[PDB]
Amino acid sequence: NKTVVVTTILESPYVMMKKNHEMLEGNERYEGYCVDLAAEIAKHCGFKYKLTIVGDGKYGARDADTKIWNGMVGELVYGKADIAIAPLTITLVREEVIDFSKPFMSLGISIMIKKGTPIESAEDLSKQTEIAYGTLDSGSTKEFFRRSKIAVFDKMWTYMRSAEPSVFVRTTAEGVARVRKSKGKYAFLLESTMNEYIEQRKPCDTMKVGGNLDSKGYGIATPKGSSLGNAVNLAVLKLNEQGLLDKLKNKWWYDKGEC
Amino acid sequence: NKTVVVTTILESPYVMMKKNHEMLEGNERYEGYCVDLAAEIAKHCGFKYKLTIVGDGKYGARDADTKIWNGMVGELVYGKADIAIAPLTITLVREEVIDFSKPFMSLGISIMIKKGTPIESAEDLSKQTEIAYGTLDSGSTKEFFRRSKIAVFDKMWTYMRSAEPSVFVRTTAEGVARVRKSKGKYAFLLESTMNEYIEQRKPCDTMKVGGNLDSKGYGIATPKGSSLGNAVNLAVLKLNEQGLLDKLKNKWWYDKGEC
Numbered sequence: 415n416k417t418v419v420v421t422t423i424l425e426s427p428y429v430m431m432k433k434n435h436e437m438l439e440g441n442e443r444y445e446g447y448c449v450d451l452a453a454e455i456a457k458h459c460g461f462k463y464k465l466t467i468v469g470d471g472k473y474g475a476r477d478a479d480t481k482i483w484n485g486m487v488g489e490l491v492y493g494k495a496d497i498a499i500a501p502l503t504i505t506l507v508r509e510e511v512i513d514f515s516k517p518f519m520s521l522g523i524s525i526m527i528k529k530g531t532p533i534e535s536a537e538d539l540s541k542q543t544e545i546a547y548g549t550l551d552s553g554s555t556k557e558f559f560r561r562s563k564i565a566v567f568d569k570m571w572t573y574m575r576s577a578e579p580s581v582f583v584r585t586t587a588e589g590v591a592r593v594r595k596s597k598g599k600y601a602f603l604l605e606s607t608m609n610e611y612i613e614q615r616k617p618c619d620t621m622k623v624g625g626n627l628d629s630k631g632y633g634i635a636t637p638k639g640s641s642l643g644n645a646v647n648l649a650v651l652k653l654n655e656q657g658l659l660d661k662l663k664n665k666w667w668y669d670k671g672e673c
Numbered sequence: 674n675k676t677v678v679v680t681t682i683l684e685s686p687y688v689m690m691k692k693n694h695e696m697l698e699g700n701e702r703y704e705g706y707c708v709d710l711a712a713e714i715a716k717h718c719g720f721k722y723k724l725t726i727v728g729d730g731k732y733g734a735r736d737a738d739t740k741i742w743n744g745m746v747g748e749l750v751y752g753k754a755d756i757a758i759a760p761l762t763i764t765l766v767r768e769e770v771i772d773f774s775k776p777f778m779s780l781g782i783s784i785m786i787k788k789g790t791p792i793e794s795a796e797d798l799s800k801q802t803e804i805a806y807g808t809l810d811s812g813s814t815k816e817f818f819r820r821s822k823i824a825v826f827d828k829m830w831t832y833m834r835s836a837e838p839s840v841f842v843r844t845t846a847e848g849v850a851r852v853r854k855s856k857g858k859y860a861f862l863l864e865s866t867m868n869e870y871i872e873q874r875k876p877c878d879t880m881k882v883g884g885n886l887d888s889k890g891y892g893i894a895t896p897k898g899s900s901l902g903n904a905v906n907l908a909v910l911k912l913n914e915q916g917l918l919d920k921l922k923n924k925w926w927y928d929k930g931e932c
């Protein structure tokens with residue numbers, strides 16, 4: 415009856431503006447993993463959709479003061495969009511306010527260094543200060559450290575929230591650029607699948623080291639009680655079971671790898 | 674109000690009989706990953722429970738003809754249990770008849786060989802016959818090959834269902850024993866986490882080879898429309914975020930690894 419409003423975010427290689435996008439219109443000006451994923455889900459759920467880029471360019475966090483949800487989560491919570499299709503992490507605080515399909519991608523927080531950086535693990539970073547390190551300000555990664563009770567991760571958090579100048583960045587591209595220009599003096603803590611993607615991008619000067627600090631997954635989100643919830647969940651399971659999600663990952667990560 | 678009836682299955686190291694269990698009673702008779710997980714979930718959701726072993730010793734499949742569900746899924750579907758806590762794979766067909774919490778453990782189908790077997794991937798396997806290979810005669814792994822349309826997995830499936838003598842086994846233990854006693858002439862297709870578990874068990878003559886064929890997860894299951902659903906799902910997320918699920922895996926997989 416109505417065109418589904420999808421909220422997503424400009425994050426390579428999930429959703430990106432096609433080259434010379436000015437000559438394009440609607441959904442055709444975007445390309446990426448979640449762009450392809452959106453098409454598949456729509457086709458399987460039988461619905462027309464419109465891709466929109468989240469107004470504040472954020473994922474989703476609740477302000478402790480105003481208790482207001484921002485980012486894509488907020489878009490769904492306050493009814494500005496019908497569904498969110500992006501690298502959105504399934505978390506307890508978010509699951510309490512919105513619904514998540516089963517994960518369409520598995521991942522965990524990882525460490526990105528400039529090749530050559532004498533860092534092999536989180537503990538390595540924790541017991542040193544020569545090499546600074548941070549995370550995306552805002553996001554599930556930052557929250558992980560902020561809420562963790564585990565010795566190593568709590569030590570890291572006390573360091574990061576106190577660091578000066580700030581060790582946090584506004585976007586992934588900023589973290590990546592910061593690592594690249596810090597001559598091995600800055601390590602970026604980000605989600606493994608993004609870490610892996612950048613490792614295959616010129617100038618091929620970064621790499622993921624160590625194991626993941628945790629294990630989470632990205633899920634398709636819908637506002638609570640949404641009628642699309644059930645169908646989308648089944649669509650995600652179906653797509654994964656047919657190997658489609660694996661192919662989409664290959665296509666955007668390695669088929670187009672530049673290293 | 675009522676003691677929650679938990680249905681689980683004897684599958685090491687998820688649920689196992691303690692030494693001299695005849696000396697013990699109730700839940701104290703069992704130990705393992707799911708036993709610990711069950712206790713953690715119950716504590717967080719605030720309910721008393723009784724661990725029970727699924728009658729037919731199966732995970733859950735629908736009979737094509739009678740369309741009746743067996744195993745743990747069947748116990749939930751037909752109201753014989755309130756919740757299922759075990760290495761139960763989240764699949765589309767199952768999600769259509771029961772509810773699953775988000776995954777508490779990630780996995781994928783993998784290849785188990787006796788040390789020295791000249792096999793490294795599903796493709797090697799599919800391109801030969803001297804080395805027999807199969808899976809459990811029941812479960813998601815078997816179902817994966819049965820419904821797969823990917824050339825490699827289809828070829829493998831056509832071989833397995835035609836194979837004589839039968840390459841399917843009644844249980845993991847049998848799959849392992851067959852691998853262990855086949856002089857390298859039999860490979861077992863099983864879920865990664867079990868493969869990894871057995872690789873750390875004496876005689877230490879088996880190992881995992883190649884990447885996983887797929888990417889899936891185990892979830893706590895409840896009957897569709899169960900009131901326990903929400904709280905359980907939230908509990909799994911919390912346990913994961915606090916890092917308890919990772920601790921339980923280390924404890925049952927590596928802390929007591931015998932190799």
Ligand SMILES: N[C@@H](Cn1c2c(c(=O)[nH]c1=O)CCC2)C(=O)O
Binds near residue numbers: 550603
């Ligand atoms: N997925 C997270 C957002 N997010 C993302 C990346 C990261 O490194 N850290 C992080 O928190 C890379 C892409 C998105 C969320 O939902 O908050």
Ligand SMILES: N[C@@H](Cn1c2c(c(=O)[nH]c1=O)CCC2)C(=O)O
Binds near residue numbers: 813864
């Ligand atoms: N997890 C599956 C059951 N199962 C299991 C293993 C396997 O190798 N294959 C399989 O289908 C080892 C652990 C249990 C299900 O839910 O049906």
